[PDB]
Scaffold this motif. Structure first.
Motif, PDB file in Angstrom:
ATOM      1  N   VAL B  59      38.640  45.581  43.388  1.00  0.00           N
ATOM      2  CA  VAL B  59      39.588  45.472  44.490  1.00  0.00           C
ATOM      3  C   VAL B  59      39.726  43.976  44.743  1.00  0.00           C
ATOM      4  O   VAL B  59      38.713  43.269  44.898  1.00  0.00           O
ATOM      5  N   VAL B  60      40.963  43.487  44.791  1.00  0.00           N
ATOM      6  CA  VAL B  60      41.163  42.042  44.845  1.00  0.00           C
ATOM      7  C   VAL B  60      41.648  41.323  46.086  1.00  0.00           C
ATOM      8  O   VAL B  60      41.928  40.115  46.043  1.00  0.00           O
ATOM      9  N   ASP B  61      41.721  42.047  47.195  1.00  0.00           N
ATOM     10  CA  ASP B  61      42.031  41.394  48.475  1.00  0.00           C
ATOM     11  C   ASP B  61      41.198  42.065  49.578  1.00  0.00           C
ATOM     12  O   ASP B  61      40.567  43.094  49.357  1.00  0.00           O
ATOM     13  N   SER B  62      41.160  41.470  50.761  1.00  0.00           N
ATOM     14  CA  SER B  62      40.306  42.000  51.808  1.00  0.00           C
ATOM     15  C   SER B  62      40.665  43.369  52.353  1.00  0.00           C
ATOM     16  O   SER B  62      39.803  44.133  52.780  1.00  0.00           O
ATOM     17  N   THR B  63      41.943  43.688  52.323  1.00  0.00           N
ATOM     18  CA  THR B  63      42.402  44.948  52.859  1.00  0.00           C
ATOM     19  C   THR B  63      42.516  46.089  51.840  1.00  0.00           C
ATOM     20  O   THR B  63      42.934  47.202  52.178  1.00  0.00           O
ATOM     21  N   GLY B  64      42.113  45.829  50.599  1.00  0.00           N
ATOM     22  CA  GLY B  64      42.234  46.874  49.595  1.00  0.00           C
ATOM     23  C   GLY B  64      43.694  47.230  49.317  1.00  0.00           C
ATOM     24  O   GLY B  64      44.011  48.365  48.918  1.00  0.00           O
ATOM     25  N   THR B  65      44.602  46.275  49.525  1.00  0.00           N
ATOM     26  CA  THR B  65      46.019  46.521  49.263  1.00  0.00           C
ATOM     27  C   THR B  65      46.460  46.027  47.871  1.00  0.00           C
ATOM     28  O   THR B  65      47.639  46.134  47.488  1.00  0.00           O
ATOM     29  N   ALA B  66      45.504  45.465  47.125  1.00  0.00           N
ATOM     30  CA  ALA B  66      45.721  45.013  45.751  1.00  0.00           C
ATOM     31  C   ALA B  66      44.422  45.207  45.001  1.00  0.00           C
ATOM     32  O   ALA B  66      43.328  44.955  45.539  1.00  0.00           O
ATOM     33  N   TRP B  67      44.529  45.645  43.748  1.00  0.00           N
ATOM     34  CA  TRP B  67      43.343  45.880  42.942  1.00  0.00           C
ATOM     35  C   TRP B  67      43.748  45.912  41.471  1.00  0.00           C
ATOM     36  O   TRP B  67      44.931  45.772  41.141  1.00  0.00           O
ATOM     37  N   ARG B  68      42.773  46.029  40.580  1.00  0.00           N
ATOM     38  CA  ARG B  68      43.077  46.091  39.157  1.00  0.00           C
ATOM     39  C   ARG B  68      42.468  47.365  38.581  1.00  0.00           C
ATOM     40  O   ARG B  68      41.421  47.828  39.038  1.00  0.00           O
ATOM     41  N   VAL B  69      43.113  47.924  37.568  1.00  0.00           N
ATOM     42  CA  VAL B  69      42.635  49.173  36.986  1.00  0.00           C
ATOM     43  C   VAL B  69      42.577  49.000  35.470  1.00  0.00           C
ATOM     44  O   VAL B  69      43.502  48.433  34.879  1.00  0.00           O
ATOM     45  N   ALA B  70      41.497  49.473  34.843  1.00  0.00           N
ATOM     46  CA  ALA B  70      41.383  49.360  33.384  1.00  0.00           C
ATOM     47  C   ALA B  70      41.916  50.616  32.707  1.00  0.00           C
ATOM     48  O   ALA B  70      41.727  51.739  33.205  1.00  0.00           O
ATOM     49  N   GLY B  71      42.578  50.436  31.565  1.00  0.00           N
ATOM     50  CA  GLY B  71      43.118  51.579  30.842  1.00  0.00           C
ATOM     51  C   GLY B  71      41.994  52.432  30.279  1.00  0.00           C
ATOM     52  O   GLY B  71      40.976  51.918  29.825  1.00  0.00           O
ATOM     53  N   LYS B  72      42.188  53.742  30.297  1.00  0.00           N
ATOM     54  CA  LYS B  72      41.181  54.688  29.809  1.00  0.00           C
ATOM     55  C   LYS B  72      40.770  54.519  28.355  1.00  0.00           C
ATOM     56  O   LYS B  72      39.606  54.717  28.002  1.00  0.00           O
ATOM     57  N   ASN B  73      41.737  54.215  27.504  1.00  0.00           N
ATOM     58  CA  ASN B  73      41.459  54.060  26.074  1.00  0.00           C
ATOM     59  C   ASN B  73      41.072  52.662  25.634  1.00  0.00           C
ATOM     60  O   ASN B  73      40.160  52.474  24.810  1.00  0.00           O
ATOM     61  N   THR B  74      41.782  51.674  26.174  1.00  0.00           N
ATOM     62  CA  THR B  74      41.626  50.300  25.719  1.00  0.00           C
ATOM     63  C   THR B  74      40.879  49.316  26.593  1.00  0.00           C
ATOM     64  O   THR B  74      40.545  48.214  26.121  1.00  0.00           O
ATOM     65  N   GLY B  75      40.660  49.688  27.859  1.00  0.00           N
ATOM     66  CA  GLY B  75      39.964  48.801  28.775  1.00  0.00           C
ATOM     67  C   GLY B  75      40.847  47.668  29.287  1.00  0.00           C
ATOM     68  O   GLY B  75      40.412  46.877  30.137  1.00  0.00           O
ATOM     69  N   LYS B  76      42.077  47.577  28.787  1.00  0.00           N
ATOM     70  CA  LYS B  76      43.007  46.508  29.228  1.00  0.00           C
ATOM     71  C   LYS B  76      43.348  46.770  30.687  1.00  0.00           C
ATOM     72  O   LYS B  76      43.517  47.904  31.079  1.00  0.00           O
ATOM     73  N   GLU B  77      43.483  45.717  31.486  1.00  0.00           N
ATOM     74  CA  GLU B  77      43.758  45.911  32.905  1.00  0.00           C
ATOM     75  C   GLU B  77      45.194  45.653  33.329  1.00  0.00           C
ATOM     76  O   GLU B  77      45.908  44.918  32.662  1.00  0.00           O
ATOM     77  N   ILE B  78      45.589  46.279  34.442  1.00  0.00           N
ATOM     78  CA  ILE B  78      46.873  45.994  35.083  1.00  0.00           C
ATOM     79  C   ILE B  78      46.521  45.690  36.537  1.00  0.00           C
ATOM     80  O   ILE B  78      45.489  46.157  37.047  1.00  0.00           O
ATOM     81  N   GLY B  79      47.347  44.867  37.172  1.00  0.00           N
ATOM     82  CA  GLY B  79      47.173  44.550  38.584  1.00  0.00           C
ATOM     83  C   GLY B  79      48.160  45.422  39.378  1.00  0.00           C
ATOM     84  O   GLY B  79      49.367  45.421  39.119  1.00  0.00           O
ATOM     85  N   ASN B 120      52.338  42.160  31.034  1.00  0.00           N
ATOM     86  CA  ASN B 120      52.542  42.712  29.695  1.00  0.00           C
ATOM     87  C   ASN B 120      51.484  43.826  29.633  1.00  0.00           C
ATOM     88  O   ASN B 120      50.272  43.582  29.515  1.00  0.00           O
ATOM     89  N   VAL B 121      51.946  45.059  29.745  1.00  0.00           N
ATOM     90  CA  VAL B 121      51.049  46.204  29.827  1.00  0.00           C
ATOM     91  C   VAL B 121      50.765  46.945  28.527  1.00  0.00           C
ATOM     92  O   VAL B 121      51.677  47.378  27.848  1.00  0.00           O
ATOM     93  N   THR B 122      49.485  47.105  28.216  1.00  0.00           N
ATOM     94  CA  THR B 122      49.076  47.801  26.993  1.00  0.00           C
ATOM     95  C   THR B 122      49.301  49.287  27.169  1.00  0.00           C
ATOM     96  O   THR B 122      48.983  49.840  28.237  1.00  0.00           O
ATOM     97  N   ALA B 123      49.838  49.943  26.140  1.00  0.00           N
ATOM     98  CA  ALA B 123      50.061  51.395  26.238  1.00  0.00           C
ATOM     99  C   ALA B 123      48.709  52.078  26.513  1.00  0.00           C
ATOM    100  O   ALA B 123      47.753  51.923  25.743  1.00  0.00           O
ATOM    101  N   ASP B 124      48.628  52.826  27.612  1.00  0.00           N
ATOM    102  CA  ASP B 124      47.376  53.450  28.009  1.00  0.00           C
ATOM    103  C   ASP B 124      47.631  54.248  29.304  1.00  0.00           C
ATOM    104  O   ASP B 124      48.755  54.282  29.836  1.00  0.00           O
ATOM    105  N   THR B 125      46.587  54.911  29.778  1.00  0.00           N
ATOM    106  CA  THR B 125      46.643  55.674  31.026  1.00  0.00           C
ATOM    107  C   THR B 125      45.764  54.911  32.021  1.00  0.00           C
ATOM    108  O   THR B 125      44.667  54.479  31.688  1.00  0.00           O
ATOM    109  N   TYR B 126      46.279  54.738  33.234  1.00  0.00           N
ATOM    110  CA  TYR B 126      45.581  53.999  34.282  1.00  0.00           C
ATOM    111  C   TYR B 126      45.475  54.849  35.531  1.00  0.00           C
ATOM    112  O   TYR B 126      46.442  55.050  36.236  1.00  0.00           O
TER     113      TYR B 126
END
Lengths: 134, 135
Positions: B59-79, B120-126
């Motif tokens: 979670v990347v801000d104090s209010t939990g209004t922004a965070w990052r998630v890793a893709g299930k297959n590749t581990g690549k993240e999106i914000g 630039n998002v890697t094909a994956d499920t987040y």
């Protein structure tokens, strides 16, 4: 609880796009016959047709267009399925490995409703899964 | 084939019900800044406000209004996070049990988007998770 999770999927262009939108504000208790509960929208810029069935442990018709779902919290069941109007939009049924699939044109909205006679619905969460084959 | 599952919820008039609807057809590769990925809808005719926070291992801000998630297959993240327009609809920022929460009016829908500069998002499920707490 009020927390909710959903998979966000990014992929290369696919032949079909499927969106399943639940109806908000559904009230527990007696409901109207064929009350709408979700809309299935299948879009495509490349394919003309698709087949669709609901996936369930209690499918109740040959085409997988009607089935029953038990509530996650109470076990109470509701009968769901495509509306009669939506079903009329199918011009052919295909059999695949002994299973019937009704065909529909892409870029259309099919309504999922509470089937048959008016149902008295217990407050609960009822998961549904629709499988679309291009 | 292409399967989609959703929860059909029937509730009592005073109940609080939350719905998170994902955007279909999202494209791997470069995306436009703030591209929508999901919409959050909160239902109740009696509740006036609610706090909402995303939950993930980063979670990347104090209010939990922004965070990052890793893709299930590749581990690549999106914000991901609430869109600027959604954030502007907030009522107040309160603190409950040592955590900062931004509050919103019931009936207001909120957009979850790819935050910041174009990604630039890697094909994956987040998987994304939004926690709603009646205020």
């Amino acid at each position: 609880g009020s927390q909710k999770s959903v998979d966000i999927v990014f992929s290369s262009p696919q032949d079909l796009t499927v969106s399943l939108i639940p109806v908000s504000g559904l009230k527990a208790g007696k409901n109207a016959p064929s009350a709408k509960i979700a809309k299935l929208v299948v879009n495509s810029t490349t394919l003309k047709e698709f087949g669709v069935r609901g996936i369930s442990n209690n499918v109740v018709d040959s085409t997988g267009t009607a089935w029953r779902v038990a509530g996650k919290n109470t076990g109470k069941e509701i009968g769901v399925g495509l509306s009669s109007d939506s079903l009329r939009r199918s011009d052919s049924t295909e059999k695949w490995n002994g299973v019937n699939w009704m065909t529909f044109n892409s870029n259309d909205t099919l309504d999922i409703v509470l089937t048959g006679p008016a149902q008295n619905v217990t407050a609960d969460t009822y998961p549904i899964t629709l499988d679309v084959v291009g």
